[PDB]
């Protein structure tokens, strides 16, 4: 019968690793670098696009940064199509929580359920895992500003600053060097771009190869606003920190 | 060789190896003999123990008052098939108030076994069966094999070294076929036939199993002290 | 079942619930506690169809206790109340609905406010200064409309409650064998033992 | 009987490639060239109708398909995979959008649905990926005109202009030279016609070229009158004649 | 559904997927539990290739199952979340029907059963996780510590350890734990637990976690300071 | 290379099972040809009866799918009959659901989509057949639509299928080059059948008796197949010419 | 409206001695005011020295007795020809009947 | 690879045969049948001195008149015990009687071959099922993952078995008293056990008609171990 | 390669090797034939007498479907039974819905489509039988032969199994020497001869003849077995012709 053609996506190696998870991570490591940095007064997400052609419609585009609800966003590294499947799940899961409890979903709870979905694909059902890693940036009134990452294994951890995709070893070293706890959001923005600027496999960072988003308390008192930077706004922030 | 991974595969010469390997567990099974006159049908089976401290595996199972079988091979597979037969004899009574013809019992077993020889992920039955009964057309003996092939016989034997008993009966044919109205003579001829298949061992009292069914005798099993009479 | 009341004063929520359990022409019990603690600062009283009431209250209690352990955190009363409403709103269109009315009294620690939610078996939720289920409301709402004040102390709330229980013992056809009273405040849930 | 193939047929190799997506893209590479150009007041999509035999009637074979009255698609790769995708795409515009909101979906969202279908063939049990890349051109009220490419992985990207298939590397280069943000629709048609001649060997005329636009609303193509606010489809397939007219002035 | 028998026997009578799951446990960070005379302690290594961690929000390694029972583990983290969730649901379900919280033996037997089921069901791989489960039966003061592993076998331990270099620390515990005389106090027991981890750990910086369980739902985490004290006190005594 | 056993892509983006299913198409060694008249559509196919023990009347690769649609298959008969039965079912259901006779091209599309699925879903093999559907559509007039194991389909002015198909094809292209039109400009279907047989003879360089052929004709509101005797009548008329 | 029950009359009677027991019943079967049969036995030997009658609606009675007889048959098959004791038969019959608690066998049963 | 329900060319089920290997690796279990009872005994085999050996539960009650000892992958046995208990209690509910030992055993063995592509693999544990019933008296059954069960006057399973079985072959006679049999199980366990037999790494149990199935406390077994040395020293 | 290890996989030739391997199992079986006659059809088969012990006459191999259809087959016997069981369900259903008994061509496609279905997936094995079958319907007599691939045609005469070519040769003579028709009683005799002639290719073991027929005039369009005086008369006729 059909056993002959079954890759057995959910088995252990003799060393006790999940091949398909390892290979998925290997896939992700060639994806555009995405960085999250957490400040005391907000969170930055920055991500680099897979080498743009000049004819790409840059402003009506969303490859790397997605809004989950009003208080939570994610940066994507890996297969985009795989990521959208998981994003709609997350978007719905946030809406059920609101509908049930009349309170926006705590960031960790949303992250756990997405990570639990990923885990399932590594233990049962014989399907390939999702080739995606997320950086979650969000706010809630229990823990305030939070950064998380999850990867195809279904493991998730929290961070002050972190990167995913290409050259994370390089980038993690640079973030470790210049990050400090008391840091404000505009310091974090600067750090995020300077880090991508040094780790990029391109000749130099331009606005047309970037996506950028903040989650500040930057509107009117004890309330949280999500900003997905328009192309022009990135170009300006690239000048204001003298990268171009 | 490359064609024996599962039942759903034919070899280049048109054989079904998993079925043939299933047939092979029968050959490893302890010997059992069946034979009949026109008035009774008899099963004799040599039972096997694990060692001197163990019981001797039952080889004969009653199916209805007028039907039963002996087994050689995988015992649980006999339990499954004999159970299926009990149900079919039962269905026939409750619905039609009719005793199940031994011929139809054969066809039903054949078709049950066959399903397992044409679909993925199952496996053939690993047991051979000798079915005796007395129905509306007299005494019958049947030989079931897990290929699905069922055969009506005057007498036969299956299991290890069944070939001796099988030739003996083939010689004795015109003698035993006419042991009518005599239970104990047909049994003796049964016991004699099984003896042509013994080696380094003869029939003891907790070693030998006989079953008889016929004109005015319900299918009944003899073990223990009530076989001594025949050694 | 029958009598369940709640009053929310300045710093606490008070639940009063009748002690009688009646089947036919027999009062089977006169000391029944028609309440479950859902979390250390949330309490739920219940009245309605025999069997359904306890089965529902315990089912809710189990889910809220599960949530508390999973998140190592206590849901707000507003959140617990919305969870409960949804369950009843599901139930009303089930094959056999839960016929249970509840009051949820809680102290929200993030807000430092007491809260009282009245929810009927249809899943009809309202937050109220005082609430009642069943015939009780026909006497107590107008009484409370008169005597209640928003800034009352827990002691003043208990007296306001005595007034309600006095009226109900005077005018209600059935002997409900008094009430068990429970206060929910910043320090959790405690039971008054003399009423 | 039934599907005992409930496991993935596309899996990660040790390098992290997804073989079957890679190989499907290779099939798209072999496929006949198609392209799309976005103007300020419209979009154009075009391809070659490379006929299998001259005894075939190639008008009966539509490579450019209406999806909604304001959205069109074209492809490169395996024709039959395209046909069923169009079928599924038209249906999903209704079931998961129009039957809910009483209006046709905006382009990015219908595209998003198609992409979802294609992603699922990349991960579900018992299937290979689709062997096509789509260019979807469309208009909607709040987003204007747009153009999207969808690949076998289910990834999609918006384009000012692009090409896919056989001679796409050359065609993309041609389009970079010629594309500007002030193109009027007739200019983009003319550029599409130039770009396509490169990658076409044989006859090049109205019967061998398939070309459709997302432009102005066409009341004459609606089918009825009397509802002022219903103005007609923006999708229009150019006729054999209309193409030849523009080739004289080529 | 996906059916394939992934956990099957091999000619030597080994179930390789169960055995490879054990490998995944061996690669996991170390966990140890030691039971006092009137308490149980759970200690856990935290692998120290990671700074820029946010420890406010990163999943702690010891989980509460009910208010009187805790579970720690070594192996795949994502797998462990599944066991913990199921264990928590069963804990509440046991209260709802039996009107009593679970015994530690019961909760262990449940989790062990889940693990075993995944070793003989179609379409699923075994849990790459072994657990230590510890606490106090309700209205009982005698402490409990159990260990489960991917095969589904479980048993009780005076003290025990799992994960990477657990053989080193099991060695330590075997020469330093008197059955006759269990760590008579909280202080005493936490110390033996920290020592055993120090054989294997590194610095006892943010590299050790300790959780103490006393009877009647008395469970508390220790903070860096208080562990650090134990670290500094044992190293000074060591200079001999 | 298990990528050669099921319908998954090969490294050069190919489906070998689909390709090998095309090779099964010619397993029967029959050629078929279809043309359009003014009023009709004619399909002819070689009929080869090797074994003398066969009942020659039961040997057929032409099928009456509906009252209006005929179908000729090039390929092994089991797969052919499997396709024929399905198409008959699909044509009947269409009538019931939508209240008009299923058009040739739509049935073609529908069978093409069914074939496409077997190229994408692993548990189904493709059918080793090519299906030529013919009718006089009530909107489109005389029609030929053909389907292959890849799930491809298109309409034809005329077509041919089988091992010697290319000869017949170029023969036909040459005729239409000369004729300058889309069809056989003939009044009766009888003379279109004559054209069909004649041009098959030139291209194949063989002569036919009445039992070497098999003819199906579609007119407005019926498709029918000719008896040996109707064909003989037709052969005779060509000979006296 | 279709009524799935009927009343076939008859009466049955069981008495137990020290070392014997009797089970008696009339042989008349009726519906309404008609006699269906003057001899239609409704007390049966069921094997293992158990006699049984299921009086009331004969269809249900014959279904029950048929099923119990079958139960005795399978008890032998599954428990090495063991004799079914009267107390065990009683309990078995409880389950037979209660299995149709929400669409009962309309019979009064004596063994 | 190859299906889980594949026959070998010798006519055996690969997966069943391989499970038999796993059982040989298991700790020793011994049962002896007398006219005064059946004794079941096991080697606990703690993998480390730190593990509390009384938590090793390899002898198990099924009903009051039926007990069970196991050897092999012992986690595989939880559900077989669960099935057995349910079957026994259920039988009593339907029939107001005790369920026969053979019937019980047959019920458990029906589980065994319900694996394939139903569970995914055979059980990796053998069982000694011991009990009493009125019709057949004291009984011992060896239930294997092949779905076959054999009755035995005495039997050994697990690692020490071929040694121990040869020992039981000589020592068993149809007049053993219960005490004689308890000693015998202790004797044979000490012979085949790696470590030195004592009351913490072996366990005894019996089932008598009068008192049903009892697991012996460590104090009781200790005195039988002391009693065993005294009888051996004195010849 | 490895194209031949899994049913429904096309080889690069265009062949399904597993079906072809099933044919080998058919060719390995005993011989069976069918002869179409004027108003009916005749079926016969060779039954190898493995042993003295086989009760003669009592292992019947020809099977009836409905009341008017006979089926006989060579190869794996249980596979043939499975096929007839399905044929029986198909004919029951046809008669249930349409009242009339199933016409023979209709019945042939029912088996054809079912057999062909077992060449479409790798999760089933093709049938290990060629099946000769037929009967009388409102349009006359029909004889059919059906192969593991699901291929079938109508036949003037047909044979399959080990003696298939010997019997074909013999059948070709008949068709040639009786162009105007063969009677039912004649065809029964011929059937016996041809089975005896085709027993040359299988002659270690000796055999038992079994015949059956449907004739509009001789059996009233119903399928009957040939027994007693008529069987013996045909056995005799065959005995003559081999000496």
UniProtKB/Swiss-Prot annotation, chain B:
The name this protein goes by in its record:
Proteasome subunit alpha type-6
* UniProt KW Cytoplasm keyword: yes
Q: Which positions are linked by Glycyl lysine isopeptide (Lys-Gly) (interchain with G-Cter in ubiquitin)?
A: 188
Role played: The proteasome degrades poly-ubiquitinated proteins in the cytoplasm and in the nucleus. It is essential for the regulated turnover of proteins and for the removal of misfolded proteins. The proteasome is a multicatalytic proteinase complex that is characterized by its ability to cleave peptides with Arg, Phe, Tyr, Leu, and Glu adjacent to the leaving group at neutral or slightly basic pH. It has an ATP-dependent proteolytic activity.
What are its GO cellular component terms? Answer: nucleus; proteasome complex; proteasome core complex, alpha-subunit complex; proteasome storage granule
Tell me, in one coarse class, where this protein mainly resides: cytoplasm
State the Gene Ontology BP annotations. proteasomal ubiquitin-independent protein catabolic process; proteasome-mediated ubiquitin-dependent protein catabolic process
- Alphabetical list of Pfam families matching this protein: Proteasome, Proteasome_A_N
Q: Which residue ranges traverse the bilayer? A: none
Curated annotation (Swiss-Prot), chain C:
InterPro entries membership: Ntn_hydrolases_N (IPR029055), Proteasome_beta2 (IPR035206), Proteasome_bsu_CS (IPR016050), Proteasome_sua/b (IPR001353), Proteasome_suB-type (IPR023333)
Q: CDD domains from the xrefs?
A: proteasome_beta_type_2 (cd03758)
Q: What are its GO cellular component terms?
A: cytosol; endoplasmic reticulum membrane; nucleus; proteasome complex; proteasome core complex, beta-subunit complex
UniProt GO MF annotations: endopeptidase activator activity
User: Is Zinc set as a keyword in this record?
Assistant: no
Q: Which SUPFAM superfamilies does its entry note?
A: N-terminal nucleophile aminohydrolases (Ntn hydrolases) (SSF56235)
The UniProt entry's GO biological process terms, in alphabetical order, are: proteasomal ubiquitin-independent protein catabolic process; proteasome-mediated ubiquitin-dependent protein catabolic process
Q: Return any one Pfam family short name.
A: Proteasome
The answer on whether this UniProt entry bears the keyword Acetylation reads: yes
Q: What is its main location?
A: cytoplasm
The chain residues annotated with the modification N-acetylmethionine are 1
> Which residues carry the post-translational modification Phosphoserine, per the record?
76
Domain of life here?
Eukaryota
The listed locations are: Cytoplasm; Nucleus
Keywords in alphabetical order, please. Answer: Acetylation, Cytoplasm, Nucleus, Phosphoprotein, Proteasome
State the function annotated in the UniProt record. Answer: Non-catalytic component of the proteasome which degrades poly-ubiquitinated proteins in the cytoplasm and in the nucleus. It is essential for the regulated turnover of proteins and for the removal of misfolded proteins. The proteasome is a multicatalytic proteinase complex that is characterized by its ability to cleave peptides with Arg, Phe, Tyr, Leu, and Glu adjacent to the leaving group at neutral or slightly basic pH. It has an ATP-dependent proteolytic activity. This subunit has a chymotrypsin-like activity.
Q: What else is known?
A: Present with 21800 molecules/cell in log phase SD medium.
Protein name as catalogued? Proteasome subunit beta type-4
Curated annotation (Swiss-Prot), chain D:
Record key words, sorted:
Cytoplasm, Isopeptide bond, Nucleus, Proteasome, Ubl conjugation
Where is this protein localized, as stated in its record? Cytoplasm; Nucleus
Entry keyword annotation includes Electron transport: no
PROSITE patterns (UniProt xref): PROTEASOME_ALPHA_1, PROTEASOME_ALPHA_2
> What's one GO BP annotation on this UniProt entry?
proteasome-mediated ubiquitin-dependent protein catabolic process
Alphabetical list of Pfam families matching this protein = Proteasome (PF00227), Proteasome_A_N (PF10584)
Residues joined by cross-link Glycyl lysine isopeptide (Lys-Gly) (interchain with G-Cter in ubiquitin) = 108
Q: Which SMART domains match?
A: Proteasome_A_N
Family, according to the entry, reads as follows:
Belongs to the peptidase T1A family.
**Purpose:** The proteasome degrades poly-ubiquitinated proteins in the cytoplasm and in the nucleus. It is essential for the regulated turnover of proteins and for the removal of misfolded proteins. The proteasome is a multicatalytic proteinase complex that is characterized by its ability to cleave peptides with Arg, Phe, Tyr, Leu, and Glu adjacent to the leaving group at neutral or slightly basic pH. It has an ATP-dependent proteolytic activity.
Q: What else is known?
A: Present with 7060 molecules/cell in log phase SD medium.
Identification of the protein by name: Proteasome subunit alpha type-2
Curated annotation (Swiss-Prot), chain F:
**Protein origin, superkingdom:** Eukaryota
The family database entries (InterPro entries) matched by this protein are listed as: Ntn_hydrolases_N, Proteasome_alpha, Proteasome_alpha-type, Proteasome_asu_N, Proteasome_sua/b, Proteasome_subunit_alpha6
Q: Which residues form the signal peptide?
A: none
Q: Which SMART domains match?
A: Proteasome_A_N
* GO cellular component labels: mitochondrion; nucleus; proteasome complex; proteasome core complex, alpha-subunit complex
Q: Which keywords fit this entry according to its UniProt record?
A: Acetylation, Cytoplasm, Isopeptide bond, Nucleus, Phosphoprotein, Proteasome, Ubl conjugation
Tell me where it resides. Answer: Cytoplasm; Nucleus
Q: What is this protein called?
A: Proteasome subunit alpha type-1
Lineage, broadest ranks? Eukaryota, Fungi, Dikarya, Ascomycota, Saccharomycotina
This protein's encoding gene: SCL1
């Amino acid at each position: 019968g059909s056993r002959r053609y079954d890759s057995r996506t959910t088995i252990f190696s003799p060393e006790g690793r999940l091949y398909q998870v390892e290979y998925a991570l290997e896939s992700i490591s060639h994806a555009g670098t995405a960085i999250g940095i957490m400040a005391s007064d907000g969170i930055v997400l920055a991500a680099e696009r897979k080498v743009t052609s000049t004819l790409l419609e840059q402003d009506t585009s969303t490859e790397k940064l997605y809004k989950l609800n009003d208080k939570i966003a994610v940066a994507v590294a890996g297969l985009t199509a795989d990521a959208e499947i998981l994003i709609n799940t997350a978007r719905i899961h946030a809406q059920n929580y609101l509908k049930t409890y009349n309170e926006d979903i705590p960031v960790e709870i949303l992250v756990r359920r997405l990570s639990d979905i990923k885990q399932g694909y590594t233990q049962h059902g014989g399907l390939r895992p999702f080739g995606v890693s997320f950086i979650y940036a969000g706010y809630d009134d229990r823990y305030g500003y939070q950064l998380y990452t999850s990867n195809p294994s279904g493991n998730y951890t929290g961070w002050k600053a972190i990167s995913v995709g290409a050259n994370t070893s390089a980038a993690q070293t640079l973030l470790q060097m210049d990050y400090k706890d008391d840091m404000k959001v505009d310091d974090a923005i600067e750090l995020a771009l300077k880090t991508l600027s040094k780790t990029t496999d391109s000749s130099a960072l331009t606005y047309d190869r970037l996506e950028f988003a903040t989650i500040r308390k930057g509107a009117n008192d004890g309330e949280v606003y999500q900003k997905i930077f328009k192309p022009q706004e990135i170009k300006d922030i690239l000048v204001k920190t003298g990268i171009t | 060789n490359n064609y024996d991974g599962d039942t759903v595969t034919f070899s280049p010469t048109g054989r079904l190896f998993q079925v043939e390997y299933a047939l092979e567990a029968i050959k490893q099974g302890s010997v059992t003999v069946g034979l009949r006159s026109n008035t009774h049908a008899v099963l004799v089976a040599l039972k096997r123990n694990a060692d001197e401290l163990s019981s001797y595996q039952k080889k004969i199972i009653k199916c209805d008052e007028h039907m039963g079988l002996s087994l050689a091979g995988l015992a649980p597979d006999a339990r499954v098939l004999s159970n299926y037969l009990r149900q079919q004899c039962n269905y026939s009574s409750l619905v039609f108030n009719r005793k199940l013809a031994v011929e139809r019992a054969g066809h039903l077993l054949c078709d049950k076994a066959q399903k397992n020889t044409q679909s993925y992920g199952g496996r053939p039955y690993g047991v051979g069966l000798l079915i005796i009964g007395y129905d509306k057309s007299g005494a019958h003996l049947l030989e079931f094999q897990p290929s699905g092939n069922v055969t009506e016989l005057y007498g036969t034997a299956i299991g290890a070294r069944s070939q001796g008993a099988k030739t003996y009966l083939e010689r004795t044919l015109d003698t035993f076929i006419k042991i009518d109205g005599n239970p104990d003579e047909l049994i003796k001829a049964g016991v004699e036939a099984i003896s042509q298949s013994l080696r380094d061992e003869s029939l003891t009292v907790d070693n030998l199993s006989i079953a008889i069914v016929g004109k005015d005798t319900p299918f009944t099993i003899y073990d223990g002290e009530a076989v001594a009479k025949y050694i | 079942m029958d009598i369940i009341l709640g009053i929310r004063v300045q710093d606490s929520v008070i639940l009063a619930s009748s002690k009688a359990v009646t089947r036919g022409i027999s009062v089977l019990k006169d000391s029944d506690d028609k309440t479950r603690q859902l979390s250390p600062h949330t309490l739920m009283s219940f009245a309605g169809e025999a069997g359904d009431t306890v089965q529902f209250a315990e089912y809710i209690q189990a889910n809220i206790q599960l949530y508390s352990i999973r998140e190592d955190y206590e849901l707000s009363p507003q959140a617990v109340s919305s969870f409960v409403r949804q369950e009843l709103a599901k139930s009303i269109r089930s094959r056999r609905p839960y016929q249970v009315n509840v009051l949820i009294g809680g102290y929200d620690k993030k807000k430092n406010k007491p809260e009282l939610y009245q929810i009927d078996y249809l899943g009809t939720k309202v937050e109220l200064p005082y609430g009642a289920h069943g015939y009780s409301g026909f006497y107590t709402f107008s009484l409370l409309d008169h005597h209640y004040r928003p800034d009352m102390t827990t002691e003043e709330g208990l007296d306001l409650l005595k007034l309600c229980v006095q009226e109900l013992e005077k005018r209600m056809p059935m002997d409900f064998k008094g009430v068990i009273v429970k206060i929910v405040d910043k320090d959790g849930i405690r039971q008054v033992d003399d009423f | 009987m039934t599907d005992r193939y409930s496991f993935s047929l596309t899996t990660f190799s040790p390098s992290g490639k997804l073989g079957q997506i890679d190989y499907a893209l290779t099939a798209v590479k072999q496929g006949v060239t198609s392209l799309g150009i976005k103007a300020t007041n419209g979009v154009v999509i075009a391809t070659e109708k490379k006929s299998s035999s001259p005894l075939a009637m190639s008008e009966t074979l539509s490579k450019v398909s209406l999806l909604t009255p304001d959205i069109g698609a074209v492809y490169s790769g395996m024709g039959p995979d395209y046909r069923v995708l169009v079928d599924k795409s038209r249906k999903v515009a209704h079931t998961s959008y129009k039957r809910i909101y009483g209006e046709y979906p905006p382009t990015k969202l219908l595209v998003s649905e198609v992409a979802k279908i294609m992603q699922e063939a990349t991960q579900s049990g018992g299937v290979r990926p689709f062997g096509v890349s789509l260019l979807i051109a469309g208009h909607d009220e709040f987003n204007g005109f747009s153009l999207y490419q969808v690949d076998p992985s289910g990834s999609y990207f918006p384009w000012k202009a692009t090409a896919i298939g056989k001679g796409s590397v050359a065609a993309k280069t041609f389009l970079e030279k010629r594309w500007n943000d002030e193109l009027e629709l007739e200019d983009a048609i003319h550029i599409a016609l130039l770009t396509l001649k490169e990658s076409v060997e044989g006859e090049f005329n109205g019967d061998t070229i398939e070309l459709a636009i997302i432009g102005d609303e066409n009341p004459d193509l609606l089918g009825y009158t009397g509802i002022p606010t219903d103005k007609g489809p923006r999708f229009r397939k150019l006729t054999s004649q209309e193409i030849n007219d523009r080739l004289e002035a080529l | 559904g996906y059916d394939r028998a992934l956990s099957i026997f091999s000619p030597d009578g080994h179930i390789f997927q169960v055995e490879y799951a054990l490998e995944a446990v061996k690669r996991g960070t170390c966990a140890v539990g030691v039971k006092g005379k009137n308490c149980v302690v759970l200690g856990c290594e935290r692998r120290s290739t990671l700074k820029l961690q946010d420890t406010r929000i990163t999943p702690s390694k010891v989980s509460k199952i009910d208010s009187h029972v805790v579970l720690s583990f070594s192996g795949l983290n994502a797998d462990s979340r599944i066991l913990i969730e199921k264990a928590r649901v069963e804990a509440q379900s046991h209260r709802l029907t039996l009107e009593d919280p679970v015994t530690v033996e019961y909760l262990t037997r449940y989790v062990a059963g889940v693990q075993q089921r995944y070793t003989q069901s179609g379409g699923v791989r075994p849990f790459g996780v072994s657990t230590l489960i510890a606490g106090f039966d309700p209205r009982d003061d005698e402490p409990k510590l159990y260990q489960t592993e991917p095969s589904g076998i479980y048993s009780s331990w005076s003290a025990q350890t799992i994960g990477r270099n657990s053989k080193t620390v099991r060695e330590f515990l075997e020469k330093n734990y008197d059955r006759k005389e269990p760590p008579a106090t909280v202080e005493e027991c936490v110390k033996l637990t920290v020592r055993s981890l120090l054989e294997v750990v590194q610095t006892g910086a943010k590299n050790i976690e300790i959780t103490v369980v006393k009877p009647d739902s008395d469970i508390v985490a220790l903070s860096s300071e208080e562990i650090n004290q134990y670290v500094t006190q044992i190293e000074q005594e060591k200079q001999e | 290379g298990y990528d050669r056993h099921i319908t998954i892509f090969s490294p050069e983006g190919r489906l070998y099972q689909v390709e090998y299913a095309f090779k099964a198409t010619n397993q029967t060694n029959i050629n078929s040809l279809a043309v359009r008249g003014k009023d009709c559509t004619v399909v002819i196919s070689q009929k080869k009866v090797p074994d003398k023990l066969l009942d020659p009347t039961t040997v057929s690769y032409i099928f009456c799918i509906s009252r209006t649609i005929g179908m000729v298959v090039n390929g092994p008969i089991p797969d052919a009959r499997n396709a024929a039965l399905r198409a008959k079912a699909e044509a009947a259901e269409f009538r019931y659901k939508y209240g008009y006779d299923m058009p040739c091209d739509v049935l073609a599309k529908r069978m093409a989509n069914l074939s496409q699925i077997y190229t994408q879903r692993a548990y189904m093999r493709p059918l080793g057949v090519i299906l030529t559907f013919v009718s006089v559509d009530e909107e489109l007039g005389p029609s030929i639509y053909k389907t292959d194991p890849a799930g491809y389909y298109v309409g034809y002015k005329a077509t041919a299928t089988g091992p010697k198909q290319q000869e017949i094809t170029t023969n036909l292209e040459n005729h239409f080059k000369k004729s300058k039109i889309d069809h056989i400009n003939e009044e009766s279907w009888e003379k279109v059948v004559e054209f069909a047989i004649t041009h098959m003879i030139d291209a194949l360089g063989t002569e036919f008796s009445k039992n070497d052929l098999e003819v199906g004709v579609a007119t407005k509101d019926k498709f029918f197949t000719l008896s040996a005797e109707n064909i003989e009548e037709r052969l005779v008329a060509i000979a006296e010419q | 409206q279709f009524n799935p029950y009927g009343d076939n009359g008859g009466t049955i009677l069981g008495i137990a001695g020290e070392d014997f027991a009797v089970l008696a019943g009339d042989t008349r079967n009726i519906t309404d005011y008609s006699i269906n049969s003057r001899y239609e036995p409704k007390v049966f030997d069921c094997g293992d020295n158990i006699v049984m009658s299921a009086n009331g609606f004969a269809a249900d009675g014959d279904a029950l007795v048929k099923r119990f007889k079958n139960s005795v048959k399978w008890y032998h098959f599954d428990h090495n020809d063991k004799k079914l004791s009267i107390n065990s038969a009683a309990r078995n019959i409880q389950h037979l009947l209660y299995g149709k608690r929400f669409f009962p066998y309309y019979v009064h049963t004596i063994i | 690879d190859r299906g889980v329900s594949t026959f070998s060319p010798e006519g055996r089920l690969f997966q069943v045969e391989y499970s038999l290997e796993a059982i040989k690796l298991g700790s020793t279990a011994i049962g002896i049948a007398t006219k005064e009872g059946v004794v079941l005994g096991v080697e606990k085999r703690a993998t480390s001195p730190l593990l509390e050996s009384d938590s090793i539960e390899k002898i198990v009650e099924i009903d009051r008149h039926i007990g069970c000892a196991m050897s092999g992958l012992t986690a595989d046995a939880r559900s077989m015990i669960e099935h057995a208990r349910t079957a026994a209690v259920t039988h009593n509910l339907y029939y107001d009687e005790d369920i026969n030992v053979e019937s019980l055993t047959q019920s458990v063995c029906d589980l065994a071959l319900r694996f394939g592509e139903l569970m995914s693999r055979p059980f990796g544990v053998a069982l000694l099922i011991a009990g009493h019933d009125a019709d057949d008296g004291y009984q011992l059954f060896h239930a294997e993952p092949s779905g076959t069960f054999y009755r035995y006057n005495a039997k050994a399973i697990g690692s020490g078995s071929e040694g121990a079985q040869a020992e039981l072959l000589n020592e068993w006679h149809s007049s053993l008293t219960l005490k004689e049999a308890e000693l015998l199980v202790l004797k044979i366990l000490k012979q085949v056990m790696e470590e030195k037999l004592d009351e913490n790494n072996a366990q005894l149990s019996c089932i008598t008609k009068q008192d049903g199935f009892k697991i012996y406390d460590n104090e009781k077994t200790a005195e039988l171990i002391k009693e065993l040395k005294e009888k051996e020293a004195a010849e | 390669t490895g194209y031949d290890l899994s049913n429904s996989v096309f080889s690069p030739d265009g062949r399904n090797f597993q079906v072809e391997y099933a044919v080998k199992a058919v060719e390995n079986g005993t011989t069976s034939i069918g002869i179409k006659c004027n108003d009916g059809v005749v079926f016969a088969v060779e039954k190898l007498i493995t042993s003295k012990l086989l009760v003669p006459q009592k292992n019947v191999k020809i099977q009836v479907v409905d009341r008017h259809i006979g089926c006989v087959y060579s190869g794996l016997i249980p596979d043939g039974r499975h096929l007839v069981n399905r044929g029986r369900e198909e004919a029951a259903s046809f008669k249930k819905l349409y009242k009339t008994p199933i016409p023979i061509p209709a019945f042939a496609d029912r088996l054809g489509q079912y057999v062909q279905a077992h060449t479409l997936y790798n999760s089933v094995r093709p049938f290990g039988v060629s099946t000769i079958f037929g009967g009388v319907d409102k349009n006359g007599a029909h004889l059919y032969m059906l192969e593991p691939s699901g291929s079938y045609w109508g036949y003037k005469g047909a044979a399959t199994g080990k003696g298939r070519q010997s019997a074909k040769a013999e059948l070709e003579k008949l068709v040639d020497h009786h162009p105007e028709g063969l009677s039912a009683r004649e065809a029964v005799k011929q059937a016996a001869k041809i089975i005896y002639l085709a027993h040359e290719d299988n002659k270690e073991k000796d055999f038992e003849l079994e015949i059956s027929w449907c004739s509009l005039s001789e059996t009233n369009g119903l399928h009957k077995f040939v027994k007693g005086d008529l069987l013996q008369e045909a056995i005799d006729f065959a005995q003559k012709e081999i000496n």
